[PDB]
Amino acid sequence: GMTAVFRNTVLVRFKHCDAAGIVFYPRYFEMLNDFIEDWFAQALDWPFDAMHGAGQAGVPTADLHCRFVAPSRLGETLTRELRVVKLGQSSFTVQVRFMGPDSGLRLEVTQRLVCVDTDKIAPRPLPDPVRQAMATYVDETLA
Amino acid sequence: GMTAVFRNTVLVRFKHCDAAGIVFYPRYFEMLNDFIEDWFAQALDWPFDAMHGAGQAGVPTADLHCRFVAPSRLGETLTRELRVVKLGQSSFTVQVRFMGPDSGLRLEVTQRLVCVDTDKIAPRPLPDPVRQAMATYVDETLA
Amino acid sequence: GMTAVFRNTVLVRFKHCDAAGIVFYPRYFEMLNDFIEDWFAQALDWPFDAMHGAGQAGVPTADLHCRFVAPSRLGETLTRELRVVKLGQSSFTVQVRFMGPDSGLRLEVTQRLVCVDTDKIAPRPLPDPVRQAMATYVDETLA
Amino acid sequence: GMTAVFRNTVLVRFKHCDAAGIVFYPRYFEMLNDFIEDWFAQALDWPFDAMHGAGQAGVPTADLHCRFVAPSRLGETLTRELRVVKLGQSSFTVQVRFMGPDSGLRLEVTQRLVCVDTDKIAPRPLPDPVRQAMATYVDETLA
Ligand SMILES: [Cl-]
Ligand SMILES: [Cl-]
Ligand SMILES: [Cl-]
Ligand SMILES: [Cl-]
Ligand SMILES: [Cl-]
Ligand SMILES: [Cl-]
Ligand SMILES: [Cl-]
Ligand SMILES: [Cl-]
Ligand SMILES: [Cl-]
Ligand SMILES: [Cl-]
Ligand SMILES: [Cl-]
Ligand SMILES: [Cl-]
Ligand SMILES: [Cl-]
Ligand SMILES: [Cl-]
Ligand SMILES: [Cl-]
Ligand SMILES: [Cl-]
Ligand SMILES: [Cl-]
Ligand SMILES: [Cl-]
Ligand SMILES: [Cl-]
Ligand SMILES: [Cl-]
């Protein structure tokens, strides 16, 4: 449909790979966080620097379900795509897919995050404009 | 009935902690992998050096589900526990819990791994002794 | 002078920073390796995938001297610049500077790497065209 | 003369090892930091949780020099040793050696750290008891 997707690419690097030149799974999760960071800065107008600084806020992960479909290797460029599954006042759920350079699905992950005060930890609502911006990404078929 | 639970501890270190003031979630996954590594070396008699070396094998992750219950902080010692959920010929599913120093649950991850040939990638059966050792960790109540 | 420099930029991310939102030093070294990887792929026509794959080669570090001049923080974009200090048949020495968005020097590192066979470790000469390409980056004032 | 050397061990893990088949060098620096962390907690009575917490302090690195002597591999246990080179009021320089299981030198790093106020960055003197504890590790022969 026309609900939004957020997309970008990531190069599989030497730092990401095991002795076989295949991606070590915790490293996918560094890739995933970088992608969420990007989405916040580019699409939601609430970059992590502002959020964790002046904002005294965070978006820690509550739940994460990841399926590793096919391996990725040193030197491949992967494409990352994000949709929003569910959006509350404080919590939000995204679905992220990583696809290889010939369009093969590499991993699919559904991730629930919660907006919190970091001084000290306690849930809080998302900023209104942020929640409004996320609403455009919502794919009602996903949940 | 009779069973076994594999358990050890890990210190939350500076390298693990982020600008929200807690453990950065990919870092939990490095701690998870370290724990699985420990299990293989210390309980299953199939250390990763041997497995990935002469063994020409690995145990890549097929599926992860992680529930983050409460945050962890610099300087805390966490307890890690492993139980086996399901055991096939090649695939195996484990449940790992991380607990805080007063036993508060921090995270629970259900993870399916698959034994593979690394030369080159293709599923293969676990060694007989290894599967037999893993069977002792089976938690029937999780089935 | 007109000897060459290799340049690119890198965003300081959440994964790079400590609890204060300042870069944790081992993370600079992940940034440094990524930059060398880039230089090999873009400038030297010998990407890490080809090098570690078909090439059965590596460029492990022999020596590294790094001065941390000023701290870097979450959300800053740093500029990375590389020059070649010294070039042998197998060994090569680079100097890398990271500068902040307002041109302040953040870190300066002189790094000696050695071309090796990875099956199994043993020095070898650089490929001729690679060594030729590095020669253009040589700043004879540096050593 | 009378002195002390701080020493402990570390296992080389899957997470540390790369596509050249050895420890990936930034990973040595995470192991270095862990070791300094250990020194502070176990020898100097100033653990990082306390230091960075109530203490509003840190010990960022100003200078690194690392000589990589021989590679390390998955499954090896390394020995880490610390000696103090130089001790000022705020700054301190340490020499750390990593050795293999048959005592072969793997790397030697000379590192200068500086005690700082984190609220906000500005050098400050080490606590008196901490400096006194560090003095016991001084290796006059390295001066
Ligand atoms: Cl590609
Ligand atoms: Cl909510
Ligand atoms: Cl939600
Ligand atoms: Cl593909
Ligand atoms: Cl029984
Ligand atoms: Cl199976
Ligand atoms: Cl299974
Ligand atoms: Cl607890
Ligand atoms: Cl067998
Ligand atoms: Cl049971
Ligand atoms: Cl900037
Ligand atoms: Cl040479
Ligand atoms: Cl050289
Ligand atoms: Cl600057
Ligand atoms: Cl004496
Ligand atoms: Cl001083
Ligand atoms: Cl000093
Ligand atoms: Cl040795
Ligand atoms: Cl004092
Ligand atoms: Cl002495």
Coordinates of C-alpha atoms and ligand atoms in Angstrom, one line a residue:
Chain A
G1 CA 0.0 0.0 0.0
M2 CA 1.1 3.9 0.5
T3 CA 1.9 3.9 4.2
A4 CA 5.6 4.9 4.5
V5 CA 8.7 2.8 4.5
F6 CA 12.1 4.2 5.7
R7 CA 15.0 2.8 3.8
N8 CA 18.8 3.0 3.6
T9 CA 21.8 0.8 2.9
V10 CA 24.7 -0.6 5.0
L11 CA 28.0 -2.2 3.9
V12 CA 29.0 -5.4 5.6
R13 CA 32.5 -4.8 7.0
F14 CA 35.4 -6.6 8.5
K15 CA 34.4 -5.6 12.0
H16 CA 31.0 -7.4 11.5
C17 CA 32.3 -10.8 10.4
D18 CA 33.6 -14.0 11.9
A19 CA 36.5 -16.1 10.8
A20 CA 34.5 -17.2 7.7
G21 CA 33.8 -13.6 6.6
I22 CA 30.1 -14.1 7.7
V23 CA 28.1 -11.7 9.8
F24 CA 28.2 -12.4 13.6
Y25 CA 24.7 -12.0 14.9
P26 CA 25.2 -9.4 17.7
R27 CA 26.7 -7.2 14.8
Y28 CA 23.3 -7.3 13.0
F29 CA 21.9 -5.7 16.1
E30 CA 24.4 -2.8 16.0
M31 CA 23.2 -2.4 12.3
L32 CA 19.6 -2.4 13.5
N33 CA 20.2 0.2 16.2
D34 CA 22.1 2.4 13.7
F35 CA 19.1 2.1 11.4
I36 CA 16.6 3.2 14.2
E37 CA 19.0 6.1 15.0
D38 CA 18.9 7.1 11.3
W39 CA 15.1 6.9 11.3
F40 CA 14.8 9.2 14.3
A41 CA 17.3 11.7 12.9
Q42 CA 16.1 11.8 9.3
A43 CA 12.4 10.9 9.4
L44 CA 11.2 11.8 12.9
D45 CA 13.2 15.0 13.5
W46 CA 14.4 13.8 17.0
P47 CA 18.1 12.7 16.7
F48 CA 19.7 10.6 19.4
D49 CA 22.0 13.5 20.4
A50 CA 19.1 15.8 21.2
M51 CA 17.1 12.9 22.7
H52 CA 19.8 11.7 25.1
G53 CA 21.1 15.2 25.8
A54 CA 18.7 18.1 26.4
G55 CA 15.8 15.6 26.1
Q56 CA 16.9 13.4 29.0
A57 CA 15.2 10.6 27.1
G58 CA 15.7 7.2 25.6
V59 CA 14.0 4.6 23.5
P60 CA 15.2 1.3 25.1
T61 CA 14.0 -2.0 23.6
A62 CA 11.3 -4.0 25.4
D63 CA 11.0 -6.9 23.0
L64 CA 12.8 -8.2 19.9
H65 CA 11.9 -11.1 17.6
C66 CA 14.4 -11.7 14.9
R67 CA 14.5 -14.4 12.2
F68 CA 17.8 -15.0 10.4
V69 CA 16.8 -16.1 7.0
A70 CA 20.1 -16.3 5.1
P71 CA 23.7 -15.4 5.9
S72 CA 25.5 -12.2 5.0
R73 CA 29.1 -11.8 4.0
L74 CA 32.0 -9.4 4.1
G75 CA 31.7 -6.8 1.4
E76 CA 28.0 -7.1 0.6
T77 CA 25.7 -4.1 0.7
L78 CA 22.4 -4.8 2.5
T79 CA 19.3 -2.7 2.2
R80 CA 17.4 -1.9 5.3
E81 CA 13.6 -1.2 5.3
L82 CA 11.4 -0.1 8.3
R83 CA 7.7 -0.1 8.8
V84 CA 5.7 0.7 11.9
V85 CA 3.5 -2.1 13.2
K86 CA 1.9 -0.6 16.3
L87 CA 2.0 2.8 17.9
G88 CA 1.0 3.7 21.5
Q89 CA 1.6 6.9 23.5
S90 CA 5.0 5.8 24.8
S91 CA 5.6 2.3 23.2
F92 CA 6.0 1.7 19.5
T93 CA 6.6 -1.5 17.4
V94 CA 8.6 -1.6 14.2
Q95 CA 9.3 -4.3 11.6
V96 CA 12.7 -4.2 9.9
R97 CA 13.9 -6.3 7.0
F98 CA 17.5 -6.5 5.8
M99 CA 17.9 -7.6 2.1
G100 CA 20.9 -8.6 0.2
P101 CA 22.2 -7.1 -3.0
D102 CA 20.1 -9.5 -5.1
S103 CA 17.0 -8.9 -3.1
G104 CA 17.2 -12.0 -0.9
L105 CA 15.8 -11.6 2.6
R106 CA 18.6 -11.9 5.2
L107 CA 16.8 -11.0 8.4
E108 CA 13.4 -9.9 9.6
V109 CA 12.9 -8.4 13.1
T110 CA 9.9 -7.1 15.0
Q111 CA 11.0 -4.8 17.7
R112 CA 9.1 -3.0 20.5
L113 CA 10.7 0.1 22.0
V114 CA 9.5 2.3 24.8
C115 CA 10.1 6.0 25.3
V116 CA 11.6 6.7 28.7
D117 CA 13.0 9.4 31.0
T118 CA 16.6 8.6 31.6
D119 CA 16.8 10.7 34.8
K120 CA 15.9 8.1 36.0
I121 CA 14.3 5.3 34.1
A122 CA 10.5 5.7 33.8
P123 CA 8.2 5.5 30.8
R124 CA 7.0 8.7 29.2
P125 CA 5.0 9.6 26.2
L126 CA 6.6 10.3 22.9
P127 CA 6.9 13.9 21.9
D128 CA 3.7 14.8 20.0
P129 CA 5.4 15.6 16.7
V130 CA 7.4 12.5 16.9
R131 CA 4.3 10.3 17.4
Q132 CA 2.6 12.2 14.5
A133 CA 5.6 11.5 12.2
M134 CA 5.6 7.7 13.2
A135 CA 1.9 7.5 12.4
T136 CA 2.7 7.9 8.7
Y137 CA 4.8 4.7 8.7
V138 CA 2.0 2.5 10.1
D139 CA 1.1 -0.6 8.1
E140 CA -2.1 -1.9 9.6
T141 CA -1.7 -5.3 7.9
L142 CA 1.4 -6.1 10.0
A143 CA -0.2 -6.6 13.5
Chain B
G1 CA 12.3 -34.9 36.7
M2 CA 16.1 -35.0 36.6
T3 CA 17.8 -32.4 34.5
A4 CA 20.6 -29.8 34.5
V5 CA 20.8 -26.0 34.2
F6 CA 24.0 -24.4 33.0
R7 CA 24.8 -21.2 35.0
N8 CA 27.5 -18.7 35.3
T9 CA 28.0 -15.0 36.0
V10 CA 29.1 -11.9 34.0
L11 CA 30.1 -8.4 35.2
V12 CA 28.5 -5.5 33.5
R13 CA 31.4 -3.4 32.2
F14 CA 32.1 0.1 30.9
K15 CA 32.3 -1.3 27.3
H16 CA 28.7 -2.5 27.7
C17 CA 27.0 0.7 28.8
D18 CA 25.5 3.6 26.8
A19 CA 24.3 7.2 26.8
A20 CA 20.9 6.1 28.3
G21 CA 22.9 4.9 31.3
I22 CA 22.2 1.2 30.9
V23 CA 23.5 -1.9 29.0
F24 CA 23.2 -1.2 25.2
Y25 CA 21.2 -4.1 23.9
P26 CA 23.5 -5.5 21.2
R27 CA 26.0 -6.0 24.1
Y28 CA 23.6 -8.4 25.8
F29 CA 23.9 -10.5 22.7
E30 CA 27.7 -10.6 22.9
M31 CA 27.2 -11.8 26.5
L32 CA 24.7 -14.4 25.2
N33 CA 27.1 -15.7 22.6
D34 CA 29.8 -15.9 25.2
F35 CA 27.5 -17.9 27.4
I36 CA 26.6 -20.4 24.6
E37 CA 30.4 -20.6 23.9
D38 CA 30.9 -21.5 27.6
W39 CA 28.2 -24.1 27.4
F40 CA 29.8 -25.8 24.5
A41 CA 33.3 -25.8 26.0
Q42 CA 32.4 -26.6 29.6
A43 CA 29.3 -28.8 29.4
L44 CA 29.2 -30.3 25.9
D45 CA 32.9 -31.0 25.3
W46 CA 32.8 -29.2 21.9
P47 CA 34.6 -25.9 22.3
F48 CA 34.3 -23.3 19.6
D49 CA 38.0 -23.5 18.7
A50 CA 37.7 -27.2 17.9
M51 CA 34.3 -26.9 16.3
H52 CA 35.3 -24.0 13.9
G53 CA 38.8 -25.4 13.4
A54 CA 39.3 -29.1 12.6
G55 CA 35.6 -29.6 13.1
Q56 CA 34.7 -27.4 10.1
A57 CA 31.4 -26.6 11.8
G58 CA 29.4 -23.9 13.5
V59 CA 26.1 -23.2 15.3
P60 CA 24.7 -20.1 13.7
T61 CA 21.5 -18.6 15.1
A62 CA 18.3 -19.1 13.1
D63 CA 15.8 -17.4 15.4
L64 CA 15.9 -15.1 18.4
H65 CA 13.2 -13.9 20.7
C66 CA 14.3 -11.6 23.5
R67 CA 12.1 -10.1 26.3
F68 CA 13.8 -7.3 28.1
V69 CA 12.3 -7.1 31.6
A70 CA 14.4 -4.6 33.5
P71 CA 17.6 -2.7 32.8
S72 CA 21.1 -3.5 33.9
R73 CA 23.8 -1.1 35.0
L74 CA 27.6 -0.6 35.1
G75 CA 29.2 -2.7 37.9
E76 CA 26.4 -5.2 38.4
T77 CA 27.1 -8.9 38.3
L78 CA 24.5 -10.8 36.3
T79 CA 23.7 -14.5 36.5
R80 CA 23.1 -16.3 33.2
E81 CA 21.1 -19.6 33.1
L82 CA 20.6 -22.0 30.2
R83 CA 17.9 -24.6 29.6
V84 CA 17.2 -26.5 26.5
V85 CA 13.7 -26.2 25.1
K86 CA 13.8 -28.5 22.0
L87 CA 16.5 -30.8 20.6
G88 CA 16.5 -32.1 17.0
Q89 CA 19.2 -33.8 15.0
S90 CA 20.7 -30.5 13.7
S91 CA 18.6 -27.7 15.2
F92 CA 18.4 -26.9 18.9
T93 CA 16.4 -24.3 20.9
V94 CA 17.6 -22.9 24.2
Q95 CA 16.2 -20.5 26.7
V96 CA 18.6 -18.2 28.5
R97 CA 17.8 -16.0 31.5
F98 CA 19.9 -13.1 32.8
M99 CA 19.2 -12.2 36.4
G100 CA 20.5 -9.4 38.5
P101 CA 22.4 -9.7 41.7
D102 CA 19.2 -9.9 43.8
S103 CA 17.6 -12.4 41.3
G104 CA 15.5 -9.8 39.5
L105 CA 14.9 -11.0 35.9
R106 CA 16.6 -8.8 33.4
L107 CA 16.0 -10.6 30.1
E108 CA 14.8 -13.9 28.7
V109 CA 15.9 -15.0 25.3
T110 CA 14.6 -18.1 23.4
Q111 CA 17.1 -18.9 20.6
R112 CA 17.2 -21.5 17.9
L113 CA 20.6 -22.5 16.6
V114 CA 21.5 -24.9 13.8
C115 CA 24.6 -27.1 13.4
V116 CA 26.2 -26.4 10.0
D117 CA 29.1 -27.4 7.8
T118 CA 31.2 -24.4 7.3
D119 CA 32.9 -25.8 4.2
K120 CA 30.6 -24.7 3.0
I121 CA 27.4 -23.7 4.7
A122 CA 24.9 -26.6 4.9
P123 CA 23.1 -28.1 7.8
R124 CA 24.5 -31.2 9.4
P125 CA 23.7 -33.3 12.4
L126 CA 25.2 -32.5 15.8
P127 CA 27.8 -35.0 17.0
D128 CA 26.2 -37.8 18.9
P129 CA 28.0 -37.1 22.2
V130 CA 27.1 -33.4 22.0
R131 CA 23.4 -34.1 21.4
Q132 CA 23.5 -36.6 24.3
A133 CA 25.1 -34.0 26.6
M134 CA 22.5 -31.4 25.4
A135 CA 19.6 -33.7 26.3
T136 CA 20.5 -33.5 29.9
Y137 CA 19.6 -29.8 29.9
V138 CA 16.2 -30.3 28.4
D139 CA 13.4 -28.6 30.4
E140 CA 10.3 -30.7 29.7
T141 CA 8.2 -27.9 31.3
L142 CA 9.1 -25.5 28.4
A143 CA 8.1 -28.0 25.6
Chain C
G1 CA 52.1 19.7 -1.0
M2 CA 50.3 17.4 -3.9
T3 CA 50.9 14.0 -2.6
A4 CA 47.5 12.5 -2.1
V5 CA 45.2 12.4 0.9
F6 CA 42.3 9.9 1.2
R7 CA 39.3 11.5 2.9
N8 CA 35.8 10.6 4.1
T9 CA 33.4 11.3 7.0
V10 CA 31.9 9.2 9.8
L11 CA 28.9 9.9 12.1
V12 CA 29.5 9.4 15.8
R13 CA 26.7 7.0 16.9
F14 CA 25.0 5.7 20.0
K15 CA 27.0 2.4 19.7
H16 CA 30.3 4.4 19.9
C17 CA 29.6 6.4 23.1
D18 CA 29.8 5.9 26.8
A19 CA 27.3 7.0 29.4
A20 CA 28.2 10.6 28.9
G21 CA 27.6 10.4 25.2
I22 CA 31.4 10.6 24.6
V23 CA 33.4 8.2 22.3
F24 CA 34.8 5.2 24.0
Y25 CA 38.3 4.7 22.7
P26 CA 38.2 1.1 21.3
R27 CA 35.4 2.5 19.2
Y28 CA 37.7 4.9 17.5
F29 CA 39.7 2.0 16.4
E30 CA 36.6 0.4 14.7
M31 CA 36.3 3.7 12.9
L32 CA 40.0 3.6 12.0
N33 CA 39.7 0.1 10.6
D34 CA 36.6 1.0 8.6
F35 CA 38.6 3.9 7.1
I36 CA 41.5 1.6 6.1
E37 CA 38.9 -0.8 4.6
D38 CA 37.5 2.1 2.6
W39 CA 40.9 3.2 1.4
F40 CA 41.7 -0.3 0.1
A41 CA 38.3 -0.6 -1.6
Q42 CA 38.1 2.9 -3.1
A43 CA 41.7 4.0 -3.7
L44 CA 43.8 0.9 -3.9
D45 CA 41.4 -1.4 -5.9
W46 CA 41.8 -4.3 -3.4
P47 CA 38.7 -4.5 -1.2
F48 CA 38.8 -6.6 2.0
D49 CA 36.3 -9.1 0.6
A50 CA 38.7 -10.0 -2.3
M51 CA 41.7 -9.7 -0.1
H52 CA 40.5 -12.1 2.6
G53 CA 38.6 -14.4 0.2
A54 CA 40.3 -15.4 -3.1
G55 CA 43.4 -13.4 -2.0
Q56 CA 44.0 -15.5 1.2
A57 CA 45.6 -12.3 2.5
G58 CA 45.4 -9.8 5.3
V59 CA 46.9 -6.5 6.5
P60 CA 47.2 -7.0 10.2
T61 CA 48.5 -4.1 12.3
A62 CA 52.1 -4.3 13.6
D63 CA 52.2 -1.0 15.5
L64 CA 49.9 1.8 16.4
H65 CA 50.6 5.2 18.1
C66 CA 47.5 7.2 18.8
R67 CA 47.1 10.6 20.4
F68 CA 43.7 11.5 21.6
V69 CA 43.6 15.3 21.3
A70 CA 40.0 16.2 22.2
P71 CA 36.9 14.2 22.9
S72 CA 34.1 13.4 20.4
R73 CA 30.4 13.2 21.1
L74 CA 27.3 11.5 20.0
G75 CA 25.9 13.0 16.8
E76 CA 29.0 14.8 15.6
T77 CA 30.3 14.2 12.1
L78 CA 34.1 13.6 12.0
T79 CA 36.3 13.9 9.0
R80 CA 38.9 11.2 8.4
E81 CA 42.1 11.9 6.4
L82 CA 44.9 9.4 5.5
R83 CA 48.4 10.0 4.2
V84 CA 51.2 7.4 3.7
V85 CA 54.3 7.9 5.8
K86 CA 56.5 4.9 4.7
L87 CA 56.1 2.1 2.1
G88 CA 58.1 -1.1 2.0
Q89 CA 57.4 -4.2 -0.1
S90 CA 55.2 -5.9 2.5
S91 CA 54.9 -3.3 5.4
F92 CA 53.3 0.2 5.1
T93 CA 52.8 3.0 7.5
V94 CA 49.9 5.4 7.4
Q95 CA 49.0 8.6 9.4
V96 CA 45.3 9.2 10.0
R97 CA 43.7 12.3 11.5
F98 CA 40.1 12.6 12.7
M99 CA 38.8 16.2 12.8
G100 CA 35.6 17.5 14.3
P101 CA 32.9 19.4 12.5
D102 CA 34.6 22.8 13.3
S103 CA 38.0 21.5 12.2
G104 CA 39.4 20.7 15.7
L105 CA 41.8 17.7 15.7
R106 CA 40.3 14.9 17.7
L107 CA 42.9 12.1 17.2
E108 CA 46.0 11.5 15.3
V109 CA 47.3 7.9 14.7
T110 CA 50.4 6.5 13.0
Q111 CA 49.8 2.9 12.1
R112 CA 52.1 0.3 10.6
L113 CA 50.5 -2.6 8.8
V114 CA 52.0 -5.7 7.2
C115 CA 50.7 -7.7 4.2
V116 CA 50.4 -11.4 5.1
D117 CA 49.3 -14.8 3.9
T118 CA 46.4 -16.0 6.1
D119 CA 47.0 -19.6 5.2
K120 CA 48.8 -19.5 7.4
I121 CA 50.2 -16.3 8.8
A122 CA 53.4 -15.2 7.0
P123 CA 54.4 -11.9 5.5
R124 CA 54.2 -11.4 1.8
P125 CA 54.7 -8.5 -0.6
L126 CA 51.8 -6.2 -1.4
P127 CA 50.3 -6.8 -4.9
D128 CA 52.3 -4.7 -7.4
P129 CA 49.4 -2.4 -8.4
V130 CA 48.4 -1.9 -4.8
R131 CA 51.9 -0.8 -3.9
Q132 CA 51.9 1.5 -6.9
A133 CA 48.7 3.0 -5.8
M134 CA 49.9 3.6 -2.2
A135 CA 53.0 5.3 -3.6
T136 CA 50.9 8.3 -4.7
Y137 CA 49.8 9.0 -1.0
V138 CA 53.3 9.2 0.3
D139 CA 54.2 12.4 2.2
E140 CA 58.0 12.4 2.5
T141 CA 57.8 15.1 5.2
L142 CA 56.0 12.7 7.7
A143 CA 58.9 10.2 8.5
Chain D
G1 CA 63.2 -3.0 44.7
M2 CA 59.7 -3.8 46.1
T3 CA 56.8 -3.3 43.7
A4 CA 53.6 -5.0 42.5
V5 CA 52.4 -6.2 39.1
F6 CA 48.6 -6.6 38.5
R7 CA 47.9 -9.7 36.5
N8 CA 44.9 -11.7 35.3
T9 CA 43.7 -13.8 32.4
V10 CA 41.3 -13.5 29.5
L11 CA 39.9 -16.1 27.1
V12 CA 40.0 -15.3 23.4
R13 CA 36.4 -15.7 22.2
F14 CA 34.4 -16.0 19.0
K15 CA 33.3 -12.3 19.3
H16 CA 37.0 -11.2 19.2
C17 CA 38.1 -13.0 16.0
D18 CA 38.0 -12.0 12.4
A19 CA 38.2 -13.0 8.7
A20 CA 42.1 -13.1 8.9
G21 CA 41.6 -15.8 11.5
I22 CA 43.0 -13.9 14.5
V23 CA 42.0 -11.4 17.2
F24 CA 40.7 -8.2 15.4
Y25 CA 42.8 -5.4 16.9
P26 CA 40.1 -3.1 18.3
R27 CA 39.0 -6.1 20.3
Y28 CA 42.4 -6.1 22.1
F29 CA 41.5 -2.6 23.2
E30 CA 38.2 -3.7 24.7
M31 CA 40.2 -6.3 26.6
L32 CA 42.7 -3.6 27.6
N33 CA 39.9 -1.4 29.0
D34 CA 38.4 -4.3 30.9
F35 CA 41.8 -4.9 32.5
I36 CA 42.2 -1.3 33.6
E37 CA 38.7 -1.5 34.9
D38 CA 39.7 -4.6 36.9
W39 CA 42.8 -2.8 38.2
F40 CA 40.7 0.1 39.5
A41 CA 38.1 -2.1 41.2
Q42 CA 40.4 -4.8 42.6
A43 CA 43.7 -3.0 43.3
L44 CA 42.9 0.7 43.6
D45 CA 39.5 0.6 45.4
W46 CA 37.9 2.9 42.9
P47 CA 35.6 0.9 40.7
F48 CA 34.3 2.4 37.6
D49 CA 30.7 2.3 38.8
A50 CA 31.6 4.5 41.8
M51 CA 34.0 6.6 39.8
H52 CA 31.5 7.4 37.0
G53 CA 28.5 7.5 39.4
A54 CA 28.7 9.5 42.6
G55 CA 32.4 10.2 41.8
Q56 CA 31.5 12.3 38.7
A57 CA 34.9 11.3 37.3
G58 CA 36.6 9.3 34.6
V59 CA 40.0 8.2 33.3
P60 CA 40.0 8.8 29.6
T61 CA 43.0 7.9 27.5
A62 CA 45.2 10.7 26.2
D63 CA 47.9 8.6 24.5
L64 CA 48.3 4.9 23.2
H65 CA 51.2 3.2 21.8
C66 CA 50.7 -0.5 21.0
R67 CA 53.3 -3.0 19.6
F68 CA 51.7 -6.1 18.2
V69 CA 54.2 -8.9 18.5
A70 CA 52.4 -12.1 17.6
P71 CA 48.8 -12.9 16.8
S72 CA 46.3 -14.5 19.1
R73 CA 43.6 -17.1 18.2
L74 CA 40.2 -18.3 19.2
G75 CA 40.3 -20.4 22.4
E76 CA 43.6 -19.3 23.7
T77 CA 43.9 -17.9 27.2
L78 CA 46.0 -14.8 27.4
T79 CA 47.7 -13.4 30.5
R80 CA 47.5 -9.6 31.1
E81 CA 50.1 -7.7 33.2
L82 CA 50.1 -4.1 34.3
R83 CA 53.0 -2.0 35.5
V84 CA 53.0 1.8 36.1
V85 CA 55.5 3.8 34.2
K86 CA 54.8 7.3 35.5
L87 CA 52.5 8.8 38.0
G88 CA 51.5 12.5 38.3
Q89 CA 48.8 14.2 40.2
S90 CA 46.1 13.8 37.4
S91 CA 47.9 11.9 34.6
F92 CA 49.3 8.4 34.8
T93 CA 51.0 6.1 32.4
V94 CA 50.8 2.3 32.4
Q95 CA 52.4 -0.5 30.5
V96 CA 50.3 -3.5 29.7
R97 CA 51.5 -6.8 28.3
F98 CA 49.4 -9.6 26.9
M99 CA 51.1 -13.0 26.8
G100 CA 50.0 -16.3 25.3
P101 CA 49.5 -19.5 27.3
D102 CA 53.2 -20.5 26.8
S103 CA 54.3 -16.9 27.8
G104 CA 55.0 -15.7 24.2
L105 CA 54.5 -11.9 24.1
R106 CA 51.5 -10.9 22.0
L107 CA 51.3 -7.2 22.5
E108 CA 52.7 -4.4 24.6
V109 CA 50.8 -1.2 25.1
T110 CA 52.0 2.0 26.8
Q111 CA 49.0 4.1 27.7
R112 CA 48.6 7.5 29.3
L113 CA 45.3 8.2 31.1
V114 CA 44.1 11.4 32.8
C115 CA 41.7 11.8 35.7
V116 CA 38.9 14.1 34.7
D117 CA 35.7 15.7 36.1
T118 CA 32.8 14.5 34.0
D119 CA 30.6 17.4 35.0
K120 CA 31.9 18.7 32.9
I121 CA 35.2 17.6 31.3
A122 CA 38.2 19.1 33.1
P123 CA 41.3 17.5 34.5
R124 CA 41.4 16.9 38.2
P125 CA 43.7 15.2 40.7
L126 CA 43.4 11.5 41.4
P127 CA 42.1 10.7 44.9
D128 CA 45.0 10.5 47.4
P129 CA 44.4 6.9 48.3
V130 CA 44.1 5.9 44.6
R131 CA 47.5 7.6 43.7
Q132 CA 49.1 5.9 46.8
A133 CA 47.8 2.5 45.6
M134 CA 49.0 3.2 42.0
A135 CA 52.5 4.1 43.4
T136 CA 53.0 0.5 44.5
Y137 CA 52.8 -0.6 40.8
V138 CA 55.5 1.7 39.7
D139 CA 58.3 0.0 37.7
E140 CA 61.3 2.2 38.2
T141 CA 63.1 0.3 35.5
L142 CA 60.6 1.7 32.9
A143 CA 61.1 5.3 33.9
Ligands
CL1 CL 27.1 -6.0 -2.9
CL2 CL 2.0 3.2 25.2
CL3 CL 3.7 -0.8 20.7
CL4 CL 20.7 -11.4 -2.1
CL5 CL 13.9 -38.0 38.1
CL6 CL 16.8 -30.7 13.0
CL7 CL 15.0 -26.8 17.5
CL8 CL 18.1 -7.7 40.8
CL9 CL 28.8 -38.5 16.0
CL10 CL 12.0 -31.0 33.1
CL11 CL 28.3 17.7 13.3
CL12 CL 58.6 -4.5 3.8
CL13 CL 56.5 0.6 6.8
CL14 CL 35.6 20.6 16.0
CL15 CL 62.9 -3.4 48.3
CL16 CL 49.5 15.5 36.0
CL17 CL 51.7 10.4 33.2
CL18 CL 52.6 -18.4 23.7
CL19 CL 41.8 12.7 48.1
CL20 CL 61.1 -1.2 40.1

